[PDB]
Design a protein around this nucleic acid. Structure first.
Ligand code: NA
Ligand code: NA
Length: 327
DNA sequence: CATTAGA
DNA sequence: TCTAATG
């Protein structure tokens, strides 16, 4: 956690690199398992050899470890860090819609910069066009203060269309958090569950609503159960207009809301731990349900959940407020 | 780890 | 269809 930080740190850097710039899923995979193990390791790594004794620890990495242990740097690391081409990939990739593949292709064509990016909007698909377009806005955190105003709004339409609609804004926001990156709204409805062969219109009505009033300005992706978009609070009585905010809303089979909702709420560690627990308590948890465990090794049979509670209850725990879902 | 675009 | 990008 700190005794092995640098090593892991350089390691991740290393890894991350093969992955994006190069197409070395392998090496890239190498660096990570190794990064994973040395991380665990209970002691100050003193040399390659020592490290080497490890699992996933080859001679390639031992080597890197020593040079880094000796000199507070790495050549390959310095070289990469410098590398323009490589610097460029790492950067374009910020655009919502640009991933490694496309980042490399763009470079190869010569789009290393944002401007380049612009001159060549034609070379860009709608997801990316918008990624570029709200680039600033997208990089910016979400003041809870605004979170609250947004939420206030969705809740209002959700209900205005059909009153049956259930919506929860999950995420860190839900976990109390001061700021957030984007708003995640978990949607569900009674007339929609496990079986009852969809009802696409269900998603589609609200989207149409939200856009109806100008809360949604753009569509990133919108399908029968997950709409990816762009929202924005009404820029008031002028002088201060609002930043453009990422927003995702999902339709949920009513029969598996709370497990889903439980989950998206996290935190990433609270989950695991929660999950780790259900297991002892003879269970299984995952993104949609919770099934009693059978001693044959495995077992099925999705228990019925009416709220975040049932789920606790089942695994027989203390209901923990979203606020303290930290770990 | 599953859902959407796109070509 | 596969393959990419987001979460
Ligand atoms: Na990106
Ligand atoms: Na393949």
């Amino acid at each position: 956690e700190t005794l092995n930080g640098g090593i892991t740190d350089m390691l991740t850097e290393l890894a991350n690199f093969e992955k994006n710039v190069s197409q070395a899923i392998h090496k890239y995979n190498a660096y990570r398992k190794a990064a994973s193990v040395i991380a665990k390791y209970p002691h100050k790594i003193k040399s390659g050899a020592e490290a080497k004794k490890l699992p996933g620890v080859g001679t390639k990495i031992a080597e890197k470890i020593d040079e880094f242990l000796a000199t507070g740097k790495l050549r390959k690391l310095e070289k990469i860090r410098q590398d323009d081409t490589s610097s460029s990939i790492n950067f374009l990739t910020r655009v919502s819609g640009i991933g490694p593949s496309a980042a490399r292709k763009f470079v190869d064509e010569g789009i290393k910069t944002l401007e380049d990016l612009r001159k060549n909007e034609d070379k860009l698909n709608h997801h990316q066009r918008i990624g570029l377009k709200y680039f600033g806005d997208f990089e910016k955190r979400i003041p809870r203060e605004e979170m609250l105003q947004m939420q206030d709004i969705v809740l209002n339409e959700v209900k205005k269309v059909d009153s049956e609609y259930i919506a929860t804004v999950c995420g860190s926001f839900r976990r109390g958090a001061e700021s957030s990156g984007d708003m995640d709204v978990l949607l569900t409805h009674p007339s929609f569950t496990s079986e009852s062969t969809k009802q696409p219109k269900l998603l589609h009505q609200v989207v149409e609503q939200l856009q109806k009033v100008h809360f949604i300005t753009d569509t990133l992706s919108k399908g029968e159960t997950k709409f990816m978009g762009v929202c924005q609070l009404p820029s008031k009585n002028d002088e201060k207009e609002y930043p453009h905010r990422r927003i995702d809303i999902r339709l949920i089979p009513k029969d598996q809301y709370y497990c889903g909702v439980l989950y998206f709420t996290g935190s990433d560690i609270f989950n695991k731990n929660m999950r780790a627990h259900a297991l002892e308590k003879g269970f299984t948890i995952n993104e949609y349900t919770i099934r009693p465990l059978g001693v044959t090794g495995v077992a099925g049979e999705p228990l019925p959940v009416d709220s975040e509670k049932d789920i606790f209850d089942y695994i027989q725990w203390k209901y923990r407020e979203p606020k303290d879902r930290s770990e």
